[PDB]
Motif scaffolding. Sequence first.
Motif, mmCIF file in Angstrom:
data_model
loop_
_atom_site.group_PDB
_atom_site.id
_atom_site.type_symbol
_atom_site.label_atom_id
_atom_site.label_comp_id
_atom_site.label_asym_id
_atom_site.label_seq_id
_atom_site.Cartn_x
_atom_site.Cartn_y
_atom_site.Cartn_z
ATOM 1 N N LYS A 28 2.256 2.609 12.264
ATOM 2 C CA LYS A 28 1.769 3.981 12.209
ATOM 3 C C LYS A 28 0.317 4.006 12.677
ATOM 4 C CE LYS A 28 3.131 4.421 7.928
ATOM 5 N NZ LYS A 28 3.782 4.786 6.638
ATOM 6 N N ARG A 46 7.457 4.026 1.629
ATOM 7 C CA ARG A 46 7.904 2.739 2.115
ATOM 8 C C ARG A 46 6.760 1.740 2.074
ATOM 9 N NH1 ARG A 46 9.668 7.083 3.616
ATOM 10 N NH2 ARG A 46 11.890 7.502 4.018
ATOM 11 N N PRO A 47 7.058 0.442 2.016
ATOM 12 C CA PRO A 47 6.000 -0.554 2.227
ATOM 13 C C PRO A 47 5.247 -0.215 3.502
ATOM 14 C CG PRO A 47 8.039 -1.635 1.560
ATOM 15 C CD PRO A 47 8.379 -0.183 1.814
ATOM 16 N N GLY A 48 3.923 -0.181 3.413
ATOM 17 C CA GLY A 48 3.128 0.317 4.517
ATOM 18 C C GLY A 48 2.830 1.794 4.440
ATOM 19 N N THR A 49 2.683 2.334 3.235
ATOM 20 C CA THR A 49 2.216 3.693 3.015
ATOM 21 C C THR A 49 0.775 3.635 2.525
ATOM 22 O OG1 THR A 49 4.409 4.580 2.505
ATOM 23 C CG2 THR A 49 2.482 5.784 1.678
ATOM 24 N N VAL A 50 -0.073 4.498 3.075
ATOM 25 C CA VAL A 50 -1.484 4.560 2.716
ATOM 26 C C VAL A 50 -1.746 5.911 2.066
ATOM 27 C CG1 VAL A 50 -3.858 4.429 3.531
ATOM 28 C CG2 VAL A 50 -2.093 3.011 4.602
ATOM 29 N N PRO A 52 4.478 -5.721 5.937
ATOM 30 C CA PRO A 52 4.416 -4.303 5.547
ATOM 31 C C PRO A 52 3.295 -4.049 4.528
ATOM 32 C CG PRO A 52 6.680 -5.062 5.550
ATOM 33 C CD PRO A 52 5.824 -6.283 5.718
ATOM 34 N N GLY A 53 2.355 -3.154 4.830
ATOM 35 C CA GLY A 53 1.241 -2.908 3.936
ATOM 36 C C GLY A 53 -0.102 -3.304 4.508
ATOM 37 N N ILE A 64 -2.800 1.373 -1.205
ATOM 38 C CA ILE A 64 -1.945 0.886 -0.127
ATOM 39 C C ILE A 64 -0.716 0.237 -0.738
ATOM 40 C CG2 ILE A 64 -1.777 -0.571 1.910
ATOM 41 C CD1 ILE A 64 -4.943 -0.507 1.938
ATOM 42 N N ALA A 65 0.458 0.753 -0.385
ATOM 43 C CA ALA A 65 1.719 0.201 -0.860
ATOM 44 C C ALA A 65 2.201 -0.890 0.087
ATOM 45 C CB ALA A 65 2.777 1.295 -0.980
ATOM 46 N N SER A 66 2.459 -2.067 -0.465
ATOM 47 C CA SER A 66 3.060 -3.192 0.241
ATOM 48 C C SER A 66 4.417 -3.505 -0.387
ATOM 49 C CB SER A 66 2.151 -4.422 0.186
ATOM 50 O OG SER A 66 2.363 -5.138 -1.020
ATOM 51 N N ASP A 67 5.094 -4.521 0.151
ATOM 52 C CA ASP A 67 6.319 -4.988 -0.490
ATOM 53 C C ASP A 67 6.040 -5.517 -1.891
ATOM 54 O OD1 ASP A 67 8.550 -4.734 1.516
ATOM 55 O OD2 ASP A 67 7.190 -5.979 2.708
ATOM 56 N N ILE A 114 -1.250 0.948 10.802
ATOM 57 C CA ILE A 114 -0.607 0.596 9.540
ATOM 58 C C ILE A 114 0.727 -0.063 9.847
ATOM 59 C CG2 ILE A 114 0.331 1.450 7.361
ATOM 60 C CD1 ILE A 114 -1.568 3.954 7.813
ATOM 61 N N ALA A 115 0.891 -1.298 9.391
ATOM 62 C CA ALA A 115 2.161 -1.990 9.537
ATOM 63 C C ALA A 115 3.108 -1.542 8.432
ATOM 64 C CB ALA A 115 1.960 -3.502 9.492
ATOM 65 N N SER A 116 4.271 -1.039 8.825
ATOM 66 C CA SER A 116 5.359 -0.694 7.922
ATOM 67 C C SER A 116 6.563 -1.584 8.239
ATOM 68 C CB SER A 116 5.719 0.787 8.050
ATOM 69 O OG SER A 116 6.215 1.067 9.351
ATOM 70 N N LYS A 149 -2.493 -2.116 -3.288
ATOM 71 C CA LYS A 149 -3.863 -2.559 -3.086
ATOM 72 C C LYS A 149 -4.785 -1.351 -3.201
ATOM 73 C CE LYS A 149 -2.258 -4.147 0.742
ATOM 74 N NZ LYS A 149 -2.373 -4.440 2.196
#
Lengths: 135, 135
Positions: free
Chosen positions: B98, A14-18, B15-16, A91-94, B91-93, A98
């Motif tokens: 998180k 999901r957006p907000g995955t590290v 998000p991200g 880092i996954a965003s919408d 972490i903002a999703s 990054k």
Amino acid sequence: SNVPHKSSLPEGIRPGTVLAIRGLVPPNASRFHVNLLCGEEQGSDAALHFNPRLDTSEVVFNSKEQGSWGREERGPGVPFQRGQPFEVLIIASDDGFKAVVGDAQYHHFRHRLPLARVRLVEVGGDVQLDSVRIF
Amino acid sequence: SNVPHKSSLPEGIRPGTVLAIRGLVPPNASRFHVNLLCGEEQGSDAALHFNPRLDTSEVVFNSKEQGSWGREERGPGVPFQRGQPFEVLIIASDDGFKAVVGDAQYHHFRHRLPLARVRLVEVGGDVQLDSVRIF
């Protein structure tokens, strides 16, 4: 050396995955890769191909869709070197991915595939992996 | 003395966004906190209140809206130790924050206030702050 390391993501990311990757570039390394893949098949489509090339001093970003690679993007120089450890965050965003290296923003890769297609993280090549973590 | 650290968020958060806090808990620490606040005035809403408490051996999560707190959430034990350094990731999703402590996700705090309202990171209490970074 933990390679090739694979992490299955049954519900995607999901957006907000590290994605946090730590390891060592061994002394004679040529290149290694971090792939965000859509399936477990050989040659699967790739939402992200992150490719530090120690032998050419480049870091290549690309995608693979319907079996064909996209146009490569390059980051600003090689923030890695042989015989030195590293810490990378992807880092996954919408909007995209990054890449953070050495606690410093490195490059931003706009999404080309839908993020919901990602199901597998693969790390391989000339790297001795310390840890791969997905938050 | 012991004034809260503040970092403004020019573009807010989405998000991200990753808040990386590295520090050390003083040997005789009682508690410290990390707040995601919606404005610069005293008493502004807190979309997230992250409060490790060494004296009561717990970590409390909460939100604040119009001066009143919400339902407290707690995590499994306390992954902090007096005199020991730590690394926290917030972490903002899309569905919440998180919180990662050490090398592992510690708690998921579902959004109670709109994410687009957060404009300030605040860290106070009994903590030695080594680095605050926003990726």
